[PDB]
Amino acid sequence: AAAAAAAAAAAAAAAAAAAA
Amino acid sequence: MKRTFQPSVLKRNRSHGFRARMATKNGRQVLARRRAKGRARLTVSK
Amino acid sequence: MIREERLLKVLRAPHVSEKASTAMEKSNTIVLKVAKDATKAEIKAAVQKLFEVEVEVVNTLVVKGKVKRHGQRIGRRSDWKKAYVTLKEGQNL
Amino acid sequence: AKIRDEVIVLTGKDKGKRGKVKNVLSSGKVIVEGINLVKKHQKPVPALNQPGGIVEKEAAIQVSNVAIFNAATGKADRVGFRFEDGKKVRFFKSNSETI
Amino acid sequence: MKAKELREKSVEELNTELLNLLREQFNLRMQAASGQLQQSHLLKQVRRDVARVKTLLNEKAGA
Amino acid sequence: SRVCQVTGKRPVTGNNRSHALNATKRRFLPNLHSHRFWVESEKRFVTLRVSAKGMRVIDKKGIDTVLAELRARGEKY
RNA sequence: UAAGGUGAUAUGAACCGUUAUAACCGGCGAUUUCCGAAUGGGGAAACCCAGUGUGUUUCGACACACUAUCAUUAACUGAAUCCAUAGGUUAAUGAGGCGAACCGGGGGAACUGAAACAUCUAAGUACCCCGAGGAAAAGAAAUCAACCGAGAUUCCCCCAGUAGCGGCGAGCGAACGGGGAGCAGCCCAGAGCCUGAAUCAGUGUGUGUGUUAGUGGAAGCGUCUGGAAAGGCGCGCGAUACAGGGUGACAGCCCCGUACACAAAAAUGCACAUGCUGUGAGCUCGAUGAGUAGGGCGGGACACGUGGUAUCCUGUCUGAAUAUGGGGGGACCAUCCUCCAAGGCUAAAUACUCCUGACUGACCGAUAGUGAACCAGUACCGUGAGGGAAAGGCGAAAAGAAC
RNA sequence: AGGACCGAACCGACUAAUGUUGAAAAAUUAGCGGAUGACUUGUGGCUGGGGGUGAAAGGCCAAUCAAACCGGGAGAUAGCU
RNA sequence: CGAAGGUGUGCUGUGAGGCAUGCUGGAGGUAUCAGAAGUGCGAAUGCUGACAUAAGUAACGAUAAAGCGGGUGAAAAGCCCGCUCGCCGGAAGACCAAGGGUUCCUGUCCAACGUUAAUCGGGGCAGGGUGAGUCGACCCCUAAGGCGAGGCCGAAAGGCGUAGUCGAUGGGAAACAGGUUAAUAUUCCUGUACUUGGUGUUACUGCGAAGGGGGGACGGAGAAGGCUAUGUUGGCCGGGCG
């Protein structure tokens, strides 16, 4: 009955802005 | 690919050492902190 | 004395448990749990005085334990030394 | 402490019933015999612990559920120990028996 | 024992104590340590007697 | 260090204040010069690093009197 | 202190002791590996190596002690250079480092506020460092007052958001005086006179009281419901104790305690007893702190930003008098009043709380409270510095469910 | 002989494709370039944040970089949501 | 002779809600009036924790294919054994560093853990196991560099650095090959040595330094020769004739 669970915070962005 | 963490006990010990943080006021305050803070893994060295 | 009874205190217990020390008991030599104290010479002078088994070298070897019991806090054994006594002519007596 | 004892026991189920008090235990328990009775389910296992039966085992009862037998009375009338003979010597206080 | 040891003179206790330890505790400490007789109670004492001998004599300053 | 050794003046500190009043720490250091004074009562040189208010004191109070001091006061003769 | 134990998860085995030297608890002592200020040298924290003595020695080897550095002192030697220092060696002392906070000194912001923002503010805070003590520092007027007088310092509440300062913006913000808390003054800069004489200090040794062990310490039964009574009902009793907790449901009289009354081998806190040790007093007459105070220059501290701006601190350059004299009383002079710096020390009142004990709480009750009631500064996460959880409860009793 | 040529190792990343809640917080496959040097890499060592380093891009300095990270000022401040 | 809370209903009040009560529950809770609050929650991409949802969907980690027959076991596509088949082979093999830190081997057990099944395993639980004069690290010696007595600087902290002393990745004395453990191995054993040091015995003799000199002691590229590991072939020997 061990437990280990973290939280994640890293980006899912890769896509670039529209119409600058 | 080449990652961050490549260990080397030789370097760790002689760049994050107990006996390498033992000679300056500031590298003394460090010890002081993790002991009255109770933190007791130290430098992680045998 | 040639050296203190402090170092005639090293032997605390016999280890001859199982193979390679049963194999090597039948074949030759004895083996015995020796402290942790770290020498050869005071050990060589130990199995002589204490006992009277004749020896000629000692082989010394740290026994570094392994992780063990409880998932409620994972533990590891205290270390010691095993020494192969290395009987000279003591294997007959 | 005033209890190696002639009790009659305060608690019900046990109320006028007697026994020796074998040993006084550290955790505020004692052993009274014939009246702490539990029906301990002995499990049988090798190299002793051989019989398989729901055995009876005097468990251990509290030490404030004891009340003390007296010679002339079933009840207790409390114990003073205060008489000096070179140590505390007991007595049921309020007739100071020397017991 | 306690006072037994306490009334013994310096020179005495010195040769007694090699004995206590070795070959009056040594014999126990090996046998027991491999199980031959589980007279386990014997270690506790002796140890706590070989302590005594080393307390005294030194602490008596050679008396 | 930058002590007079006659009176031992440490550098005071304080703010500049400009013709539009702009404070900024800047350090007021004594003068300090190594001068070889002549004991004449041991007849040797006692090069001491001393200021130039300091020097005036040594001449006015007398050689073997500041040399009395310093040694009595805990800093190197 | 005591009839029962062998700390805990955790049982159990073997045994020990049974009121009188077990076992339990305290004082004192001993031991206190190795690392760590760590210190014989070295070093990747918990390791490696060595010198010199005192030995032992079965002649093989193996112990034990000392050996750091720095400050001071003493002795010994002793260059360049006769000399002498300088230096070096040695020895005897004392120090070093670790702490949470408070305190004094040294150093010292920025965000922010000013609706921006630079003077100002934040704040001389935070923070770093150094130093020390149980309090610290400060302190026996070159302090005020106002034509009367007051008389060391400190701290509290005022005075009073006054007076005043102020990109007169924001804001900062006293004192004088008043009431209290709490109160002791003294040396040296020198000759005496008597010559431990007060007085402290440190050594004694004791007397008292306190603490660190603890001990004793009161008075209820019947009955009904109930798994169980400590609840209900009925009849009693103790009270310098009805504080609390525990015991099978809510117990003054069931138990541990409790007030109260006792109790110390020793070791120490506190008063006082008095020896010694050192300290220096008490009367005469002298003394009254120069590279200083002022002053020029530049800053800082004063509520006060140089502004009309004293005064105090002082880095720079000068540079005065010597009690028929000097300082100050907020530009400055005069007068008048009042005081004697540049030598030094000092209790208390007051601040603070890591830690210790005892108690208490309209504080919490397990997403709370500390992060943390449970093997928590842990597990984990990070190279590190560091960051940093979850997870409490069967039951009255393990009787933890034989078969 | 050669910062020579062709090209494994080794290093590096020019194209495309596949991936792109992946097999993987930058890789894989087929091609590609360099290749005894201004090479490349192991071991160890050295530069510190207003600073380094930089055949130079504001790149890189622990998956973070036009001023790292961590603690603290600090519950900064936010007329803003 | 059944509190709170939970969970249902009736009644009731303008409402917030209250009251009565059945079931659950096994103990505490509190009229009234007044006093105080961490005093009322649906929303903060709130926070923590629980459990959904997409869904039994996606995927199941290489296009280096496995197949059979036994064995055990309750259960075999995957495991063990055996026989084929395929794959790598300057590695997907072997030795070793770094790093890890028992993951090794043996015996047992399958909840959880392997992205399945699981009799299996680097899992759990027991046990066992790492052996050196010569190997390597300590060690001797130093390198870049570091720390640094004295010292000079610097408010302090500290900074630098001399004499020193550390610091490998270099240099320094020396063991090889069989045989052997369930698992070790240049270490144990066996065979055959070598190295250095101490002491002593003997002989002989000018020995002696934080000292002097020499020697240690060295680049890149290229170019052969000489040589051997080793390989190929034949010979030899053994076995074989489909």
Added chain:
RNA sequence: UACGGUGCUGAAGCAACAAAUGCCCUGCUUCCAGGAAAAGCCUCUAAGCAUCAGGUAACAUCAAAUCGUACCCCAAACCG
């Protein structure tokens, strides 16, 4: 033999040829960029020592400690 395998025994065991990036060779040649150090080693003396002691050689004899060493090691034990 238990069917995991263990013991008992043992023939031949040569030659030629090809070789390596390995060794001789940290050499040699050559080239311009001009290519560690210290100690051990050997040797000379200084202060010093004097039938000594030390040095050198042999022989006899003894000592040579402590840790790592398992296993993985292009990986399923390392890093992600």
